[PDB]
Design a protein around this nucleic acid. Sequence first.
RNA 1: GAAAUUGUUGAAAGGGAAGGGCAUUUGAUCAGACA
RNA 2: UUCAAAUGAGAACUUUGAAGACUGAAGUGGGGAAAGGUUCCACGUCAACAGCAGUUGGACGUGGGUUAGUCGAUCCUAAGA
RNA 3: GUGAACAGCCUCUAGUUGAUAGAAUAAUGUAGAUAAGGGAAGUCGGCAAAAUAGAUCCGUAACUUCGGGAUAAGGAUUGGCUCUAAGGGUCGAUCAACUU
RNA 4: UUGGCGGAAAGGCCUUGGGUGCUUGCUGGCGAAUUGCAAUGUCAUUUUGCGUGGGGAUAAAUCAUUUGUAUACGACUUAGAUGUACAACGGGGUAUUGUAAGCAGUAGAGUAGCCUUGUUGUUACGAUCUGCUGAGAUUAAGCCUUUGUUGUCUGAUUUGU
Lengths: 337, 107, 97
Amino acid sequence: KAGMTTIVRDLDRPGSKFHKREVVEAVTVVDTPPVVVVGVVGYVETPRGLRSLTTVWAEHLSDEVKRRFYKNWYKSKKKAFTKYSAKYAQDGAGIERELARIKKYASVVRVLVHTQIRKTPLAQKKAHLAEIQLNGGSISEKVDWAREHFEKTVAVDSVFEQNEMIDAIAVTKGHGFEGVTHRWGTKKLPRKTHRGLRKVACIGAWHPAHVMWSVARAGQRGYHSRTSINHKIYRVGKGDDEANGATSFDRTKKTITPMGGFVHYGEIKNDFIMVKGCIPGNRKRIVTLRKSLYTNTSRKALEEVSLKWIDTASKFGKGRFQTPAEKHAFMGTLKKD
Amino acid sequence: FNSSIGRTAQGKEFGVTKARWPAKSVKFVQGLLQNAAANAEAKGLDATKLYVSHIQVNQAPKQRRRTYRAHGRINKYESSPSHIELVVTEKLTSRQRGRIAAQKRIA
Amino acid sequence: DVVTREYTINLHKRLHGVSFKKRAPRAVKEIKKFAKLHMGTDDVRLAPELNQAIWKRGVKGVEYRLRLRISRKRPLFSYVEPVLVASAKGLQTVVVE
RNA sequence: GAAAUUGUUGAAAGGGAAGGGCAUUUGAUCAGACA
RNA sequence: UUCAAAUGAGAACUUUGAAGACUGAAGUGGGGAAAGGUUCCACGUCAACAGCAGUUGGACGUGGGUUAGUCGAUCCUAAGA
RNA sequence: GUGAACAGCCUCUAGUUGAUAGAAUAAUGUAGAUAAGGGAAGUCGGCAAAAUAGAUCCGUAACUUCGGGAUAAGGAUUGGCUCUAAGGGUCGAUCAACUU
RNA sequence: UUGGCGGAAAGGCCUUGGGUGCUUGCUGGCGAAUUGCAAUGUCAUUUUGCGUGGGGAUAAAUCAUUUGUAUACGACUUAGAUGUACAACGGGGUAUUGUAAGCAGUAGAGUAGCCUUGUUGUUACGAUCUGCUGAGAUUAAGCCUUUGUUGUCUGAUUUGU
Ligand SMILES: [Cl-]
Ligand SMILES: [Cl-]
Ligand SMILES: [Cl-]
Ligand SMILES: [Mg+2]
Ligand SMILES: [Mg+2]
Ligand SMILES: [Mg+2]
Ligand SMILES: [Mg+2]
Ligand SMILES: [Mg+2]
Ligand SMILES: [Mg+2]
Ligand SMILES: [Mg+2]
Ligand SMILES: [Mg+2]
Ligand SMILES: [Mg+2]
Ligand SMILES: [Mg+2]
Ligand SMILES: [Mg+2]
Ligand SMILES: [Mg+2]
Ligand SMILES: [Mg+2]
Ligand SMILES: [Mg+2]
Ligand SMILES: [Mg+2]
Ligand SMILES: [Mg+2]
Ligand SMILES: [Mg+2]
Ligand SMILES: [Mg+2]
Ligand SMILES: [Mg+2]
């Protein structure tokens, strides 16, 4: 997640007062460089639930993924996957043997992918590794697809498209220990209250002689897992395309990055996804975008969205200019130049 | 004696969460370790083999002061002294017999 | 080894949001921490002339920038002195022969 | 130089108390007849 | 409150210098009545006391110090005894 | 010095710099504060808080023991700078005050 | 040893070939005692340790330091042994305020002084105004960026089927 901005578009909604009229909406931008496939995993149905049977890794792994396996990378000998790579040094009978096992027994196939964290302006340098399920085709086709994509990159435009409802999964911003008044939204006690007023006056009756689980108590606020659904994609952005922040109406040559860069994040030099509304999590946090679990047809979806204007003024203050050229034209020459 | 004390990451070496840095008690122990090593050298023991084979702390008689409380009351205000000592050192029935006899001549 | 260099320390960002009664004493400890980072010496000694420069405008009137001369001498310790300049702006690290 | 209470060493047990009664297993320890 | 030096086995707290501050003349200044009784001053010294510390102290040990014809008491009488 | 002022605020002389410290800045507190639109709907009750505030000029009701009520209520003005007028002492001259 | 099958916790089942042992399917020949008239009369499989020799493999974690997407303390998330490395400064961008100091002016309500009484007399005092000047200052402390400058990069502890 990089940050938020504003867009202007026409509303296509018959029967509404603002039909065929411009509306102003907030959007969230997610920086999405291509992910790299580095393995596959097969799952077997069991009376006790799904069980992973075998994992097969790619022959070569970059230092980004290898950093995930270390806590003290700078002191390590970097021996990870050194003996496993020897399985490819032969004809490949060992690798082919495990792939046949996945084809024969597995009923669910997932691929191990990792982000290219070096392409972001972040300082982490350690990539995030995750499993993504493959849908479509038979079990053999899924394994063959995973095998051919080892050490390759998959772009975001091959997964999502325009005007598609997606779900965002992330961890919310943390706030530490919080009192009941803001953690749960209980009423503040009168000003006359002795011993403090940001509390719950009665936490339980005499019987049962215990505090119940359903009573509001002070504790940790934030940093929770959340799954927010039904977010429409407004734009699938291209990293190498100049005029990312341009529309068919604005026609100015400008990228999606606002003047001065995204606050606390930086510049967007990769592909991005523009999502209507707000998304759980703060800036610089890793997020997972997932396709919807059902076919939505409430006419809020299926609507074709065409952006007219994208705000690129500075978010570090009351920004007034979209581009440096606009500032120079309005102000003229300065003593600095 | 660790009730309601803080916890630190430096306790993971000894598999605990609660640990502290009692500087004053450390200095008293250091002085006695120095004295014991000097005594060992005077006797003629090998310093490289010395290990602490005995160390023991006992309660000394308390030293008493007074503290003043609300509504004109007086409570005690006492110290807990210690006694410290340490030592360093250089590092068949007849039926059973018949069965045994039978087995000897059987193999 | 023994070396003398001149530094510019940004005290504005190091005293951001500090209680007014503690800003000048905090600047003393920040300078000692600053000398530890660059010279790697546990012992840091501040000249009384530098102490006057820090407290020039009261307990809460510390300058935004200070020009410091740091000398590492003989196991080793760092000695910090002020440098008399019109302004501390636009100066980078230089080595003093 | 007793008890409450405490340190060290040794042995033993411990899934929201501990202690007790009857019986036996296991470990440790011990008197009595060799007429 | 801060920097440095001196002393010391040991210094956030002792001494000196420098800096930053406060009381702001109905004072955190300069004297007294009552009450206390050597707490005054010098040297030596840190077990206990100064609810942290201590080389410092109204602490501990040993000594020194209060000079009137004119300042008070003394004399007079008050309510009263 | 400011000002009506032994008010509050700052300084000179003189005297102190003494009250366990270091690090961090969660909840809940104690103390000090600010809030869009509404304006007592809160509460036993405007509790608490807010508003008003010096001075000069204008203006001031019922009632009344004629003394009051009264700062009733209700309005206006206030910096800095450069000037002007008036208000004195001693013997035409000469010298010296902040008041409007 | 050959081949096949079994993934629900497969760790098992079936099969090919030869070697070697036994065979009570049938007929023989030797041995047993004394544990004294019974005494479980000791024939199982659990785990671990120390010594033999026959192969096999040559790492990490924690503390300390650092980061703020985290945080009462622990915990969490990052970085650091030669580099699209990290840090401290500097430069640029982005922001906030609203035109710095200094110098100059035939700007400026007016009032004084001098000789030379000057058809802007000069010289002093004078809130303020104008020009240089959308200037100057501040800008990550939880903003972005960097072919510049100067540095930094082997301390401690513990873990084995
Ligand atoms: Cl009492
Ligand atoms: Cl609070
Ligand atoms: Cl932390
Ligand atoms: Mg809410
Ligand atoms: Mg009350
Ligand atoms: Mg913003
Ligand atoms: Mg407890
Ligand atoms: Mg507590
Ligand atoms: Mg008390
Ligand atoms: Mg009392
Ligand atoms: Mg005795
Ligand atoms: Mg006892
Ligand atoms: Mg005051
Ligand atoms: Mg003052
Ligand atoms: Mg004295
Ligand atoms: Mg004490
Ligand atoms: Mg002491
Ligand atoms: Mg309001
Ligand atoms: Mg309002
Ligand atoms: Mg009401
Ligand atoms: Mg009500
Ligand atoms: Mg009130």
